[PDB]
Every structure is written in C-alpha cells, then in structure tokens.
Enzyme design. Structure first.
Site, PDB file in Angstrom:
ATOM      1  N   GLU B 423      17.223  14.670  61.332  1.00 41.41           N
ATOM      2  CA  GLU B 423      16.414  14.804  62.573  1.00 41.41           C
ATOM      3  C   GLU B 423      15.262  15.778  62.294  1.00 41.41           C
ATOM      4  O   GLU B 423      14.757  16.393  63.251  1.00 41.41           O
ATOM      5  CB  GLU B 423      17.326  15.328  63.685  1.00 41.41           C
ATOM      6  CG  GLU B 423      16.923  14.935  65.093  1.00 41.41           C
ATOM      7  CD  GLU B 423      17.871  15.462  66.160  1.00 41.41           C
ATOM      8  OE1 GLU B 423      17.489  15.455  67.342  1.00 41.41           O
ATOM      9  OE2 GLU B 423      18.993  15.885  65.807  1.00 41.41           O
ATOM     10  N   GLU B 432       7.621  19.488  59.444  1.00 43.39           N
ATOM     11  CA  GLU B 432       8.812  20.382  59.383  1.00 43.39           C
ATOM     12  C   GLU B 432       9.453  20.297  57.992  1.00 43.39           C
ATOM     13  O   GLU B 432      10.532  20.890  57.810  1.00 43.39           O
ATOM     14  CB  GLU B 432       9.802  20.018  60.489  1.00 43.39           C
ATOM     15  CG  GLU B 432       9.264  20.299  61.878  1.00 43.39           C
ATOM     16  CD  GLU B 432      10.250  20.079  63.011  1.00 43.39           C
ATOM     17  OE1 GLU B 432      11.355  19.552  62.752  1.00 43.39           O
ATOM     18  OE2 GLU B 432       9.907  20.435  64.155  1.00 43.39           O
TER      19      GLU B 432
END
Ligand SMILES: Cc1cc(NC(=O)C(=O)N2C[C@@H](C)CC[C@@H]2c2ccc3scnc3c2)cnc1N
Ligand SMILES: CSC[C@H]1O[C@@H](n2cnc3c(N)ncnc32)[C@H](O)[C@@H]1O
Ligand SMILES: [Cl-]
Ligand SMILES: [Cl-]
Ligand SMILES: [Cl-]
Ligand SMILES: [Cl-]
Ligand SMILES: [Cl-]
Ligand SMILES: [Cl-]
Lengths: 303, 625
Positions: B423, B432
């Site tokens: 995720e 990220e």
C-alpha cells in the site's frame, strides 16, 4: 428645512423660479423640489410658494409645460410631480423604477408629452408622460451617460454624450437611431450639451478639460472651440435673446457668458462651491440666475 | 443555501436601508461610503475649502455591523487613469480618502471597478494603500464577463458592432484583471467580483476565469427573464454558470432596481436559493473533501516518518479501496491454487507495510471467499502501528498471522512468499518510494511470485490557478531559500483551477522487477497541446495502479475509482507563471533522481518558454530512504 446642495434652477414662462436640491452629505441623503413666485426670496424656505420632500436626491430637473416637474432621481426612478390647482402643493403623479443606477440627465422633447432620460446604467430611455411607460430603451454607449438634450423643434431627434467619449445624434425614425459625431480626433470626454435655439443642426458641447466647442451636424466638423474654464464644463445654457449669449457652468466655481464666437463677455467668481445650473429670466432677458453647492442663488446683470 | 448581498447606489438613510435588505434576506449590503454624486476638490480653491461634514457618521451603525454587513464602493467619478492631469491628481487623493475611510470603519471588503484597459495608476494607489499598515480588509475588483463596448446594442449607424470573431479580443476583460493583479504583485487582499450580462460570451471567455480568485458574482435584475406566473428566472446557460459558481462557493450580489413590480424584490434572491437548495447533497466523499478544497499539505513520507494513529484511521476509512485489494487477492489465489490442491496447497502471503492491518483483514476475507488456505505475515517498520497489529494478533487473528516489526529491505524471511501485498503508493505513485522498498523485499518473493500491485503509473497535467500559485507563494518561511516553497510538491484537493491539457503518463514501475540492471531513476519529456489562452502555474499529479489483472485503483480524474478518498492529487508548482496562448504546446521535463540516502524529483518547462530546473540536487525537497 432645505438641503445644502442646490442642483437645478429653471424659470417658468410667467417668471416663477423652480429649484431642485439634494443632501450629498450628513445623516439623510434625500432631495426636495421648491417653487418661488418671488425669485429674490429664494433660497429661503419660509418665503417659498410650494415645497415637497423626495425619497432620494435630484441629479437633474426640467419643466413639463406649466404645471409638470420631471425629476432624475438617485433611486434610478424617473418621477413626474404635478403642481396643485392653486400652486400651494407639489404632488407625485408617477414614480417608475426603470433604470438600474442613478438617473443623471432628463430632457423633455419638442411635443412636451414625451421625455428622454440618461443614467449611469449606460442606457438611454424614451418616456410617454401620458401613459407613464418607457416606449424605447437604448444601450448605445459603453459607459455612464453624462448629458441628453432634446432638439428644440424635432420630437424624434435628440443628442447624448457619455464617458465612452461618444457624442451621439439620435433620430428615432431610423432602425439604427444613433450617429457618432465629435471633433476629428478622440478629444477629452464630453460633459455638457446644448442645442442652438434658432440655428437648427448646430449645438455646443463642453468637455472635462474646461473647453467649450461649437459643432455643426451638417458639416460634422469641429469648426470652433475656446478654453473657457480651468475645470469640467457641467452646464451650457443659451439666452432667449435674438442674438443669444451662451452661459457656461464649471466645477472651477465660475459662471462665464459667451457670444456667437465663444469670446468671454462676462464672468462671475460669486460662488464658493461648484456652479450646478443656470436659467435666464423671461421677464428681464439681461438677468441670469445661477445656483451652486454653496447654497447661493446669485442674480447676475449681463451687459 | 447561498450567501447573498444587495448592491445599491442610493442610500437615503443607512439604518432603514440595511433593515430593508435584511427583511429581503440579504446577508450583507454593498453601498457608497460617500454620496456617489458628491465630487470633492483637493487642490484648487475655493471648492477645496468646502464646509463639512464630508459624509455620514460612523456612529450610525455598530462596529459589528461595519465589520460584517457593509461592503464599501469607490465613488464612480474617481478616475485615477484620466488623460487630464487635474482629474488624475484629484482622483488619487479622492481614492485614498475613500479607501482610508473604509479602513477606519473596518469594512470586510471594498469594491473598485475595472471597466477599461489602463488601470495602472489605480493599481499604484491601491498597492500604496495596501502597503500602509497590515490590515485584513479585502478589495473586490468589479470586472465585467463581457466589456460594455462589446455588449452594446447595434444601434449606432456609423459605428457597427464587429460581427467578425476575435478569440483574444473577446477575452480582453480577463487581461484587464491579469494586468492589474500583476501590477499589484498578486496581493492576497485583491480578489474578483465577476459581473454577468444578459448575453453570455463563448465558453473559452468564461473558462478564462477558472483558477482566478472569484469572491463575488454580480447579477443585475436585467438578465432575469419572466415565467408565466411573473416570478424572475434565468436561462439554461445562466443556470449552468450559477451552478459553476456555487461549486467555487462565491458570494452572489444582486444589483439594479425591481422590474418584476407585481412580486416582492426578495423573489430575485429566492430563485438563487431554489437553484442552490435543489442540488444533489454532498453525502459521501464530497463533504470530507469540501473542507480540504485547495488546502496545501506536505506529502506524507511513511518510510522516513512513523505515521500517527489518526492518519492510518483515514487510510482505513475507504471501503472501495480494500474491496479492490480483497478482489485482487481473491482472483490471484484461484489462479495459483487449482481446486483439487485447495486443502494441500497453503499460500505464503506477506503484507509489506501492514499499518493497523486492513490489508491483513482483506487477505483473510479473500481466502475464505476463494476457499483457499493462506499463511499471513504482517511486516510493519512503524513500531507504534505494530502495537495495533500484535493486539489484533493475540485477540482475533491468532497463529495464522505472524506480525514482523522490521523494514522489508532488512527483514530475513524464514520462507519465501507466493504473493506480496503493499500500500506504499503516494498521490504521484512512486513518491513514497514503493519501488525501492519492494525491490529490497523482492529476494524473499518466490521465483513465480506475484506483487499486488504488479504495476503503477504516475500522470501529469498542466494547470492554471492564480489562487493556488498565491497559496504556494504564502508558504515562504524564515531560515530557508525564499523560493523553496515553489521547488517542492503539495498534496491538495485541487478545486479552483483549470486543466490546460489531458493528463499523460509520467513514470511507470513493474513488480517484480527481474531486470539485472535495476535503475529506478527516470527522465520523461511530455508535450501538452493547449487549445486556450491561459497562464501556467504548475502541474497536477495523479496515479493509476494494477493490483492484479483488471482490478485497478486510480485518482486520474477521467478513470477515477468511484467513492475513493484515500488519496488527493499532488501539485508541482513553478517559481514564475508562464503565458501560454491558443495553439502553443507546453513542454515539461520531469526527472526522478536518487543517491544511497535520498530520492527526489526535478522538473522544468522547456516550451513555449524555459523555466529554471526546479529542486536541483533535492535542495528544497528530498524523500528519505
Ligand atoms: C494509503 C496511503 C494514502 C495516502 N494518501 C495521502 O497521503 C493523502 O492524499 N492524504 C490527503 C487526505 C486524504 C488526508 C490523508 C492524507 C494526508 C496527506 C498529507 C498530510 S500532511 C498531514 N497529514 C496528511 C494526510 C498516501 N500514502 C498512502 N500509503
Ligand atoms: C499503509 S501506509 C504504508 C505503510 O507501510 C509502512 N512501510 C513503509 N516503508 C516500509 C518498509 N520499508 N518496511 C516496512 N514497512 C514499511 C509504513 O510505515 C506504513 O505503515
Ligand atoms: Cl475624510
Ligand atoms: Cl462579506
Ligand atoms: Cl485560465
Ligand atoms: Cl498502471
Ligand atoms: Cl517510466
Ligand atoms: Cl526523455
């Protein structure tokens, strides 16, 4: 009581003085209409013939025959005030809110049954004073309408000038009724309009720079002009004389009476605030009455 | 319902007037603070020495009323850009006087008109007033959607209305505002009051005002049509524009007199209320997102930083997102384990970045749905979130789930994984550092192992927003580069902006990445065709991801997953706005750069003009490994 800022001053055929007034400062920004059978008694309230209060200030005024008073209101209404049978009272005949901003100028047409109004909403409207309705509504200009002036003798013809720097001649018999005139190049904004009393197709216009110009619609050229005032020319009025004098009003707080060639004959520094309106006495054609925001009613003697 | 105001140019007495517009149902009043016809002289005598008072008293209303209910209007005779020097100098002094009286009364807004091209001196005076004591007051620049000159009746015989099309000429009114706000140096106190006429222009002229700081929309009584009953109404094209402005959440100003005399004046306002009230309520997503509209936030870095408990809570409150993850896993288990092997074959399933274990629960639901055995590992480096997992593990899950408290690039796994579920995606997919993380975790994936997601792609679209440009500009901090705020991305629910071209793909990553020479650095050149005149302020960023086969997540507007609010778009601004006129192509260059310690983005516009390269050496923005 009366308001400080005298806006309108017009003589009736019998020699009675009609004053329009506004409160342009203080608590209440209202207006008032006054009739003076003794013109020297003005502007004193106690020695007036008739008086009434209006909801808002008067921006411009004019007679409608002998008993009618047409008013350009701050409210956006054009309102007609009927004079009493005995001329002791001034009663509202109609008040119609058809403009979306201040009504700045009104002018009765040659017939006397119809009028034309100019407003800051940029629109010019033609009124039926009998039916109390707007016959036509025109959006010719691109900025607020400064002055509208009906032709003396032609009911379908009138002038208009605006801050879009246009001077429009109107003929309501044409499908495109407006026609642009003015001096060769884009001059300073036109502020005042007056038709010549006798010479048809001839008018004078004042600008914001203090210049008064004589123009012929037939020649559509800037034949003559003169730097009369040091500030904006707010009013132009011709005299009833056979060879008429031209009284020019300005924010420089001065009256100036001019000949046919716009040469300075007379001038008055009597007013200590803006000179708003001027009207010639039909009893004594040499006598000229001016009003200003200094609350003065000065009676001049023009040689 | 709508926040409405009344515009009057005639106030006989303020108390009775304000009371009247209150009964009508107006929230505020626009009015002159000096009588509009009361022209004042400042230089030449004797008018200079005019006895006072110069206007009505501040004692006529309470301080609350001035602060809340009253919007000032510049007197129409004030012309600071007059060709006459006398009128210029006097209008300068007049303008300051009226502005200073507004500041004295503490008015929340003051209206000034733009109704010609040259407002240079107007700007100079306003800019000087703005930079004279720090105040809160707003300046609403009254700009027509169509210039009165281009709206006039074709009734002048020798000056006909130009029937020929002028694309740029029909946008002139926007150029009036653009030049003004540029001269005033994009002051946050200067907003737009867009005035709408009876005849609306071409859509491109309306779309020009997308991204502009519109605080007010002025509706004259003229533009309103009349129904059979006599009530005031608007055309379908006017209704369209109202619904566009109701989304922008602007205040509506009613101007002009009552032409519908038969009915009360409140009818005009009651119609606006009817339009706004008869609209689909926000319900799901829309209300949560409404609060965040054009709110600049720093992008989360779940690798470098440990996320707070409430940040995981909003991640977890997205049923559609976890419905998809469940379906992706459900499909994968049926493909890997034949029906006859359901009891024999038990799949090793590793959640890499488990947080508080919503993917762990999604995996268990998927397993018993698919009727297949799974052995679960919950890998999470955030030791605060591991508290949530291990309490889950002891109370509910049991031995089936094995919680591992470590970094997935460090962790030495006891056995290899059939499926890895992650995720680790930001608003720009890879921002990220999902690639670097899954790369490091790839060694304990089985030779024929599956990654969920298996693919993700970032998308860029050039945008115009003078609003958002100004919000970035206001993020200047002490003790760093004064332009640092322009060289870093923001996660923002983009609202008041203009998409200048269709989003194109930027960077793609596949998992597993079996390539011998793994390089996650990227250099991408994008050609954005622009078919409008506009100003480039930055690039909107989105992403798509393949979880498994046809099961996908997307925050790309065109293909956006219905009712999913885990991600808002990202914004890459630029230092200087760039003019882009109809036909021109916007060329943007995007680099994904890295060393051993940091990952960052650099970006540059190369057409129609070159910008500076933004965030060189990650000086302004780095993503920590
Ligand atoms: C699951 C997931 C989800 C996301 N999504 C996001 O980051 C995101 O778009 N938003 C915006 C909004 C929905 C609130 C949460 C979060 C956010 C962003 C910035 C800051 S700054 C202080 N708080 C926050 C919150 C990113 N990564 C992952 N892995
Ligand atoms: C659900 S948001 C992504 C989650 O993945 C976790 N995460 C990010 N990078 C790693 C990593 N390298 N190893 C383990 N967990 C990680 C973060 O701490 C967060 O809980
Ligand atoms: Cl003052
Ligand atoms: Cl407000
Ligand atoms: Cl735009
Ligand atoms: Cl993809
Ligand atoms: Cl790529
Ligand atoms: Cl490339």
């Amino acid at each position: 009581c009366m308001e400080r800022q005298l806006e309108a001053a017009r003589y009736r055929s019998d020699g009675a003085l009609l004053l329009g007034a506004s409160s342009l400062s203080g608590r209440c920004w209202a207006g008032s209409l006054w009739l003076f059978k003794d013109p020297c008694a003005a502007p004193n309230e106690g020695f007036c013939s008739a008086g009434v209060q209006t909801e808002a200030g008067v921006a411009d005024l004019t007679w409608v025959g002998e008993r009618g008073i047409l008013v350009a209101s701050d409210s956006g209404a054009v309102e007609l005030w009927e004079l009493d049978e005995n001329e002791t009272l001034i009663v509202s005949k109609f008040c119609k809110y058809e403009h979306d901003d201040i009504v700045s100028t009104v002018s009765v047409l040659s017939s006397g049954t119809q009028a034309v109004s100019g407003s800051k909403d940029i629109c010019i409207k033609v009124w039926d004073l009998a039916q109390q309705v707007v016959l036509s509504s025109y959006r010719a200009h691109a900025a607020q309408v400064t002055c509208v002036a009906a032709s003396p003798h032609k009911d379908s013809v009138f002038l208009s000038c605006s801050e879009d720097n246009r001077i429009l001649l109107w003929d309501t018999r044409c499908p495109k009724p407006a026609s642009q005139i003015g001096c060769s190049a884009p001059g300073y904004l036109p502020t005042s309009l007056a038709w010549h009393p006798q010479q048809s197709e001839v008018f004078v216009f004042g600008d914001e720079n203090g210049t008064v110009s004589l123009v012929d619609t037939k020649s559509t050229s800037c034949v003559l002009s003169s730097a009369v005032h040091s500030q904006c020319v707010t009013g132009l009025v011709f005299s009833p004389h056979s060879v008429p004098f031209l009284a020019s009003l300005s924010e420089d707080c001065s009256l100036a009476v001019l000949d046919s060639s716009l040469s300075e004959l007379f001038r008055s520094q009597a007013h200590r605030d803006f000179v708003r309106d001027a009207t010639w006495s039909p009893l004594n054609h040499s006598l000229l009455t001016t009003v200003g925001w200094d609350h003065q009613v000065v009676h001049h003697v023009v040689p | 319902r709508v926040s409405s105001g009344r515009d009057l140019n005639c106030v006989p007495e303020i108390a009775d007037t304000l009371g009247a517009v209150a009964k009508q149902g107006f929230d505020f009043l626009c009015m002159p603070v000096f009588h509009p016809r009361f022209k004042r002289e400042f230089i030449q005598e004797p008018a200079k020495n005019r006895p006072g008072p110069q206007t009505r008293s501040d004692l006529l209303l309470s301080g609350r009323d001035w602060n809340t209910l009253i919007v000032g209007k510049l007197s129409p005779w004030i012309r600071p850009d007059s060709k006459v020097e006398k009128i210029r100098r006097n209008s300068e002094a007049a303008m300051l006087q009226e502005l200073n009286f507004g500041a004295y009364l503490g008015l929340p807004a003051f209206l000034l008109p733009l109704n010609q091209e040259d407002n240079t001196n107007l700007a100079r005076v306003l800019t000087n007033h703005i930079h004279t004591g720090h105040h809160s007051s707003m300046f609403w620049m009254r700009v027509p959607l169509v210039a009165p000159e281009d709206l006039r009746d074709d009734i002048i015989e020798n000056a006909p209305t130009t029937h020929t099309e002028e694309y740029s000429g029909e946008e002139k009114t926007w150029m009036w505002w653009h030049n003004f706000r540029t001269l005033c140096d994009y002051s946050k106190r200067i907003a737009v009051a867009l005035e709408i006429g009876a005849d609306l222009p071409s859509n491109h002229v309306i779309d020009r005002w997308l991204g502009e700081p519109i605080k007010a929309a002025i509706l004259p009584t003229s533009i309103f049509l009349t129904n059979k009953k006599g009530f005031p109404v608007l055309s379908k094209m006017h209704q369209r524009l109202i619904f566009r402005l109701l989304k922008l959440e602007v205040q509506f100003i009613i101007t002009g007199t009552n032409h519908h005399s038969e009915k009360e004046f409140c009818s005009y306002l009651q119609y606006l209320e009817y339009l706004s009230q008869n609209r689909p309520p926000p319900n799901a997503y829309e209300l949560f997102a409404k609060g965040y509209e054009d709110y600049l936030q720093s992008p989360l870095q779940p690798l470098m930083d440990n996320l707070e408990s409430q940040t995981y809570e909003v991640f977890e409150k997205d049923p559609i997102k976890y419905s998809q993850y469940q379906q992706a896993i459900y499909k994968c288990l049926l493909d890997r384990v034949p029906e006859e092997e359901k009891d024999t074959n038990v799949q090793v399933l590793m959640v890499l970045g488990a947080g508080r274990g919503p993917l762990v629960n999604a995996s268990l639901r998927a397993a018993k749905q698919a009727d297949r055995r799974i052995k679960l590992y919950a890998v999470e480096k955030n030791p605060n979130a591991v508290v949530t997992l291990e309490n889950w593990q002891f109370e509910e899950w049991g031995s089936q789930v094995t919680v591992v408290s470590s970094d997935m690039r460090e962790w030495v796994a006891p056995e290899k994984a059939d499926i890895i579920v992650s995720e680790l995606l930001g608003s720009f997919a890879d921002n990220e550092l999902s690639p670097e993380c899954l790369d490091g975790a790839q060694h304990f994936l089985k030779d024929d192992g599956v990654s969920i997601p298996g693919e993700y792609t970032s998308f860029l679209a050039p945008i115009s927003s003078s609003k958002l440009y100004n919000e970035v500009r206001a993020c200047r901090e002490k003790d760093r580069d004064p332009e640092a705020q322009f060289e870093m991305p923001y996660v923002v629910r983009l609202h008041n902006f203009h998409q200048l071209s269709a989003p194109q793909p930027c960077f793609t990553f596949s998992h597993p990445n079996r390539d011998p020479m793994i390089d996650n650095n990227r250099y991408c050149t994008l050609e954005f065709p622009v078919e409008v005149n506009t100003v480039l302020h930055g690039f909107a960023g989105y992403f798509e991801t393949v979880l498994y086969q046809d099961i996908t997540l997307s925050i790309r507007p065109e293909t956006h997953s219905p009712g999913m609010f885990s991600w808002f778009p990202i914004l890459f601004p630029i230092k200087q706005p760039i003019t882009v006129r109809e036909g021109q192509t916007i060329c943007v260059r995007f680099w994904r750069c890295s060393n051993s310690k940091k990952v960052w983005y650099e970006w540059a516009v190369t057409a129609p003009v070159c910008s500076a390269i933004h965030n060189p050496t990650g000086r302004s923005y780095t993503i920590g490994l």
